[PDB]
Amino acid sequence: GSSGSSGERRAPRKGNTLYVYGEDMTPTLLRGAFSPFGNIIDLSMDPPRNCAFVTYEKMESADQAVAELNGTQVESVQLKVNIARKQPMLDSGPSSG
Numbered sequence: 782g783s784s785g786s787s788g789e790r791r792a793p794r795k796g797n798t799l800y801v802y803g804e805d806m807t808p809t810l811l812r813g814a815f816s817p818f819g820n821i822i823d824l825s826m827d828p829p830r831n832c833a834f835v836t837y838e839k840m841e842s843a844d845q846a847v848a849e850l851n852g853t854q855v856e857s858v859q860l861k862v863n864i865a866r867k868q869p870m871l872d873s874g875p876s877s878g
Contacts, residue, residue, distance in 0.1 A: 794844030798823065798868045801833040802861040811835055814855045818846045
């Protein structure tokens, strides 16, 4: 009998920001952890909720990371990435930051 589900949960690819969650991970860590996928233009960490918002210069990466970085164990730390919800078209090159 089929051990598990036949295949994986199909899903589209779109988004700039990514919802990351960890326990013993640091900002500088995510920098070299998400960099491999692409360029980080927006990376923020919230000790309170122990999460991190990493934005990629492109949308192609957003799905990528969420596909690999999802449930991945980097630097001896399990990082949980997801496609942030409610992320409409946002400027890429902010001048009046």
